[PDB]
Amino acid sequence: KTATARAKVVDWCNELVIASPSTKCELLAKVQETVLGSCAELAEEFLESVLSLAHDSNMEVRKQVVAFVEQVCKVKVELLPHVINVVSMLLRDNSAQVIKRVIQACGSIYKNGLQYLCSLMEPGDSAEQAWNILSLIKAQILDMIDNENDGIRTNAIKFLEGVVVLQSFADEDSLKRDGDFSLADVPDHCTLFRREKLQEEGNNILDILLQFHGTTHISSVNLIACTSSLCTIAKMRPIFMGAVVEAFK
Amino acid sequence: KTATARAKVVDWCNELVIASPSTKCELLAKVQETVLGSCAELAEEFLESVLSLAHDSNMEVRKQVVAFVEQVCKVKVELLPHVINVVSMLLRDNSAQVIKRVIQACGSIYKNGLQYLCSLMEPGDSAEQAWNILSLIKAQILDMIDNENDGIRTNAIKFLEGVVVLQSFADEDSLKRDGDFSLADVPDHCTLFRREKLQEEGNNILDILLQFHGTTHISSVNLIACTSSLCTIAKMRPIFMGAVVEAFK
């Protein structure tokens, strides 16, 4: 039933308060399975209790909260506003492993977020506020290709790749991929932001990638990832193929 | 029932003999839907009648036979031996559009073929014979990166990318992809061919790609495709990352 599913979550949450890191990770997984699956109507009630562990001192625990937040945005995107702040602050984490994980989660979070927010007719102030945190997140990650952790850069590159593809127009020559989404898919009525500003932002993110590509001390891992994303961009959005080929030569 | 499904196929096939190109394409689609889906036990009976159109003078018709053959190898791989010759001969087609399509179909055909043949215990002479036609096909496509049709080269590059990834060992650092398959997945008992020969062949195909990458007159489209496949190879099989980065610089 529902009262019994909720009763277990309450017990699981109360144990989170006193559990070991390892067990906290296990209880988060269980709570997620229930409030974001089996009994999804329970999600909002326990959001607070879960988001609280974003402050835990153990990084594995924090990475677990990241997984929970990414899930929230795949299946309960209405709650994106209530979890999007954790995303942004965890991008300022002290652990690189946590940041690399957050950057990864942002790929789907930003995409799902964009698809949701731009679909709302006359979005409220919570929607608008959330859209701003997303804009801030894009900036936070953009600055990270200059981070000193190689892995953080690799992830940032990939994340930026998807924003470019999202914030651009797919033409009749765009490589075909099933999940593709572009500025062309944005409803005409939407007024939360508007095509050209994102298109310009996308163009600029590309400039940074093209630029980063030719930096003398780019790591071999960062070169592959950057080269790869550039090719993907050039294939998904041909309009950029000129600039990409120029960078390659 | 089965007699009625088969009766319609017979009528559809008899019309193929006298239909227009456009209608031939339509009847092939219908026959495929039935003999490779709704009533898959009918496939072997009508294989001959279908493979016959591989000789049609209209190229759209031939491309339709290509689609049929690729399907056969996805769902009735036992029949790969009976259709694999059409694949090889159509790679010698006069139409580039036909060849580009065949090359594409070979991606799944070779993969499905490899997965099937190497799974058989004490494979028969038909299996062995088929494995040879596959080896011949790999060679036919390998020579095509030097073809004068830009598009044929683009496709050949991609096809070769998958052979390299297939004919190599995935380690604990290989980028994760759900369908991945490597020489490590080949049964220990298999004696149709053996790991090192494919591994060597894979290494050589890579040499050709790395080499082609730096040719002075590589087209921008061919550069992107080649650069892209190299990155993919380097990510899927790290052991090659050194050589790929070297090529990029």
What does it look like?
The structure is a homodimer of 249-residue chains. Chain A has 249 residues and is mainly alpha-helical. The first copy, chain A, has eleven helices and no strands. Chains A and B meet through α10 and α11 of A and α10 and α11 of B.
Topology record:
The structure is a homodimer of 249-residue chains.
Chain A: H1 2-16, H2 21-38, H3 43-51, H4 59-75, H5 80-90, H6 96-117, H7 125-143, H8 150-166, H9 195-213, H10 220-236, H11 241-248
What's the oligomerization state?
Answer: homodimer
Going by CATH, the architecture of chain A would be: Alpha Horseshoe
CATH-defined fold name of chain A: Leucine-rich Repeat Variant
Kindly give the count of domains of chain A: 1
In total, how many beta strands of chain A? 0
- CATH level-4 homologous superfamily of chain A: Leucine-rich Repeat Variant
Subunit structure (chains A, B): Interacts with Cpsf73 and Cpsf100 forming a core cleavage factor required for both polyadenylated and histone mRNA processing. Interacts with Slbp and Lsm11.
Subcellular location (chains A, B): Nucleus
Protein name (chains A, B): Symplekin
Organism (chains A, B): Drosophila melanogaster
Please give a handful of descriptors for the protein shown.
globular; Symplekin (chains A, B); homodimer; Leucine-rich Repeat Variant; 249 residues; mainly alpha; 0% strand
Outline:
Chain A has 249 residues and is mostly helical. Helices cover 69% and strands 0% of the residues of chain A.
